[PDB]
Amino acid sequence: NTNLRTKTLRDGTTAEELFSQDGLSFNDFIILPGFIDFDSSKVNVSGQFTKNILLHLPLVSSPMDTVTESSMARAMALMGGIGVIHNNCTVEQQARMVRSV
Amino acid sequence: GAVLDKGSVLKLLAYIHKGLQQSAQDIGEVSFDAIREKVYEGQVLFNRRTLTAQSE
Amino acid sequence: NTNLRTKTLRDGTTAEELFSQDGLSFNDFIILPGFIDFDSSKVNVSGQFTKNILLHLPLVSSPMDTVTESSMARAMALMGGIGVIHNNCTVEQQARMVRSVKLYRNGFIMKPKSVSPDVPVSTIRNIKSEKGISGILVTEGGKYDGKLLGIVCTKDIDFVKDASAPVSQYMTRRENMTVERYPIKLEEAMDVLNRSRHGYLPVLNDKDEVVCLCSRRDAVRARDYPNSSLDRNGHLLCAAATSTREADKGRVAALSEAGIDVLVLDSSQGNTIYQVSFIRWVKKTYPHLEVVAGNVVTQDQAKNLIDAGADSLRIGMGLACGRPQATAIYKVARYAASRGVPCVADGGLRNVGDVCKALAVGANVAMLGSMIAGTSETPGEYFFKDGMRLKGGAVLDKGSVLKLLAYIHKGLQQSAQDIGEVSFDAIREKVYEGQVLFNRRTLTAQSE
Amino acid sequence: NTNLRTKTLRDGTTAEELFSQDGLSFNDFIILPGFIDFDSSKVNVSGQFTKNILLHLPLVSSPMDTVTESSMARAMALMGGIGVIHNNCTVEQQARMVRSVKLYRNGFIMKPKSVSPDVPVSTIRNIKSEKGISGILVTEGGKYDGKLLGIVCTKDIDFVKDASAPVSQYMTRRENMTVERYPIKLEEAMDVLNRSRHGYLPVLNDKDEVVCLCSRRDAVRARDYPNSSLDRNGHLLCAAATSTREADKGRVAALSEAGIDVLVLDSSQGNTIYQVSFIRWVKKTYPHLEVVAGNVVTQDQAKNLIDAGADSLRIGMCGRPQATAIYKVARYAASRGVPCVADGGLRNVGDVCKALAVGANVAMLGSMIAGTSETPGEYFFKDGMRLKGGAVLDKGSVLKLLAYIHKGLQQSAQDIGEVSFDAIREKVYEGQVLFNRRTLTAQSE
Ligand SMILES: Nc1ncnc2c1ncn2[C@@H]1O[C@H](COP(=O)(O)OP(=O)(O)OP(=O)(O)O)[C@@H](O)[C@H]1O
Ligand SMILES: Nc1ncnc2c1ncn2[C@@H]1O[C@H](COP(=O)(O)OP(=O)(O)OP(=O)(O)O)[C@@H](O)[C@H]1O
Ligand SMILES: Nc1nc2c(ncn2[C@@H]2O[C@H](COP(=O)(O)O)[C@@H](O)[C@H]2O)c(=O)[nH]1
Ligand SMILES: Nc1nc2c(ncn2[C@@H]2O[C@H](COP(=O)(O)O)[C@@H](O)[C@H]2O)c(=O)[nH]1
């Protein structure tokens, strides 16, 4: 299907051009649609958290004392993402939370 | 310093997950690795919206 | 007057230049005035719905379950536009609605509604409430092509109290009826029916069997609505929507039998292998049907669907705030125009100003959704709340769509007059030519 | 079911007690529920407009030029209410409007619209477009009582291309017409008409001159609108407004001759010598007319106008609170056999019900029906809204709206536990229908 998927007319702004001026918000632009020959269930959303770690789910929980402790970090990793235990606590507390995950 | 209950994060993650897939489907690539690549390649394209185009 | 009309100074932005940057809304710009040497009444607002269909009125009703069913589709076609029957219903229901639009206006009525003499008066009173017709023929066996016994009309049964009485008791019987013999020209049949001062004229063969029927209503409809959108057979035009699943192949056949003229593909993004496969299949299997592909918003999408053989394209949305409709329409319509394919503007039309802009920047016709919801001819039940009359997720009553269409119509003419061209075909041409010019408005210029 | 319907515990406030203090709006109280042993459809909402006129539908269209000209008055009367032709117009205009209402529905149409054979089709199309009538008779010299030559109907001229042609060519000639001979009882002529499958039946004298006419349309309107408000001649009822100046004595004569059944006095405050005098004059001069005095808001005003010979009173018009005003004035006037019209403060069906329950026989609608199809003015568009022209939204046909208010009153009466509003009014005074005042906190949901 490469003939149908690849653009020749290329009607739209390229990213290099889009960001070549003002500082933009996400609201300042939209992504133009392409060509579909597959069910959305087959889409691979994975991404590299780090050079050697690939998250199946490109989601990381923020390291805030109101969001990520042992319980959240567990949930994130189970779903394919990861958690970052906040550092607003004693060294003993934070390590206790890591062991717990 | 108070926020609404949003249920289990497990349900919320699966909702985000399903949302990413529908969006990447709209763009027309079967992975975000490919979307990133083709953004740089100039095959995935954008449109800047005017401010009044953003109000509708 | 060409010397006075054609611009040399050309003070204003060209369209190619206007849309060369940001994605624009219709509000982001205005069309600069031209030169006027004609009354607005003479303006030709027509546009191509598809390659072979030209709408006198560049208006299409949206295929939503809240806007277009049989009643609306009738109204649109009568005024010179067209309707697209929504696809949120069984195949049987949707086809029932198509037949209902096609057979509303006839030349010769081929399968006239018939009943037997046994049938009670009550039954005929139900037919005028449901189908909306009279002049029901009473034939042998109820067969629509049986021996003609009589005819039932309004003044025959309005005074009757016992609704159980057979029709034979109150019908006008064959001996007293004025009929005609087949074959006869339609031109003559209607002159006979007119001079006859009756509302109906059966046409029979040698054995007094019913061949067809003429209605005087189809004479006045031809008179009160001289711009109606008709097919070769004098029947109103009717489009219908459909998805592009394999299952929907069966739905297309049904609609084809019911006699739609245009197939509108229903998709929020039509640049799919499915839609492409589907279009190819329709054109191969049903060559007589024109197909409106979509929705699309880019030239790249548009290329694929025109390749597959689309006769038209829907531009717009209908996740997800997408490509600004003004830009989308300009870009796609221009591309498609080169491939000889017209475009339908489908989204972002809040008022008449917007519709005019959408047609000037390249759309041949505009699809109306919200702008006509709440009119008499839309599906829904009327009700009251807080002294307001509503329809049903509830909208205000807007009277008959027929009045509203004529208001849009008059509005397009005044606008095209301001621009200074006697047709929207010419405005589109001269937009591309760089003779009709625009001005982008600043945001504060838009606040006054 | 008396042992169930009659209250002995009597948990609630009587009206006499409820209105014994400060002036109440309709929102200040509610009517406590009763006992139900009947379907709502069986409820009789009728009320006395004047002493001798009982409206099936206790609703009157206001005499405002925004609301009631000829078209509205018809619609009201057909549904069982009545219209009051406004007076912001010439005497000539106002009587012309009255005639349109009276001569709309007939039994026998006297003075049929008739034309000469020389007249072009163009004229028949204009009579059809303006006055809305068809079945135009063709007679000698166009005299409504001339020798009958033919009849012109829609199917005779809808197909004609040359609008200047004389009706003679396309009319149905007297030779081919089904007629009848005078005298003939109406109910028999209407039977011939139904049997003939025609839309019109002229009745002639011995010399083939037109005495009167029968319209099949009038037979459908008796079938479709069985509760139409009619006089003793089968015409729709019609009221018209007038002020009480000397100048207006002329106006009353014109309106009386046009055929009004009820005169409605237009005054911001009716307790004036001018109205007292005027009422006496109308009664000495035109005793066949019922008069509606007002507006008034106190018993003291009511006495003077009732003394003068009023047959009804407008209650309303910043001022005295309307719920109190209706109660205080209506109770007094009831004791003297005079019914009252509620004219003010009616924003919804709920208000209407309360107004009628606390003593008004009929209500006068103004704003609540402004913007309906039948009100004067033209429609126009703006901002995706349909409007009339100071502007109001399209409310559709008033006929649908009136049926809504009707069913609304029936539902309300059912909750209160009585099968008629006469009953409710009676039992309010008797203390068997009870209310409850509401705190301002209890009003805010
Ligand atoms: N072809 C015909 N020949 C003779 N009489 C007819 C014919 N068609 C209808 N009629 C009679 O004419 C009378 C009604 O006339 P007409 O058909 O003009 O009424 P109409 O208002 O057009 O009916 P509808 O409103 O139901 O269409 C009836 O008695 C009917 O039987
Ligand atoms: N009294 C009559 N005798 C004979 N023919 C009549 C009579 N009245 C009307 N007609 C004829 O009937 C035809 C018109 O149809 P009809 O009378 O059934 O009602 P109509 O045309 O629907 O009435 P309207 O003009 O109010 O619409 C014409 O040909 C007319 O000449
Ligand atoms: N007798 C009669 N039949 C009509 C008229 N108009 C349409 N028809 C026919 O009535 C049929 C519609 O009824 P259905 O088939 O839906 O029961 C179609 O065959 C249509 O052509 C009319 O005015 N009179
Ligand atoms: N021919 C005819 N006359 C009517 C009909 N209905 C009312 N009229 C009469 O037409 C006349 C109209 O009065 P005008 O408006 O001309 O003063 C009145 O005499 C009225 O009674 C109708 O259906 N046909």
Author numbering:
A (entry chain B): 3 to 103
B (entry chain B): 439 to 494
C (entry chain B): 3 to 320, 331 to 404, 439 to 494
D (entry chain A): 3 to 319, 333 to 404, 439 to 494
Quote the authors verbatim.
Inosine-5′-monophosphate dehydrogenase (IMPDH) catalyzes the rate-limiting oxidation of IMP to xanthosine 5′-monophosphate (XMP) in the pathway of guanine nucleotide synthesis and is thus a key player in the regulation of the intracellular purine nucleotide pools of almost every organism. Recent evidences indicate that the activity of the catalytic domain of IMPDH is allosterically controlled by a nucleotide-mediated regulatory switch.
In cellulo grown crystals of TbIMPDH isolated from baculovirus-infected Sf9 insect cells diffracted up to 2.80 Å resolution, exploiting the 40-fs X-ray pulses of the X-ray free-electron laser (XFEL) Linac Coherent Light Source (LCLS) at the CXI beamline. The crystals belonged to the space group P4 21 2 containing two TbIMPDH monomers in the asymmetric unit (ASU), corresponding to ~75% solvent in the crystal lattice. Extra electron density was identified in two clefts on the surface of the Bateman domain that were unambiguously assigned to one ATP molecule and one GMP molecule. However, instead of GDP or GTP, GMP occupies the second canonical site in TbIMPDH, exhibiting a flipped, so far unknown nucleotide coordination mode for Bateman domains. This enables the formation of direct interactions with the catalytic domain, resulting in a stabilization of the compact IMPDH oligomer conformation. As a consequence of the observed flipped binding mode, an interaction of the two bound nucleotides in the canonical sites via Mg2+ ions, coordinating two ATPs, as described by Labesse et al. and Buey et al. for A. gossypii and P. aeruginosa IMPDHs, is prevented. This is confirmed for TbIMPDH-ATP1/GMP2, exhibiting a bending angle of ~115°.
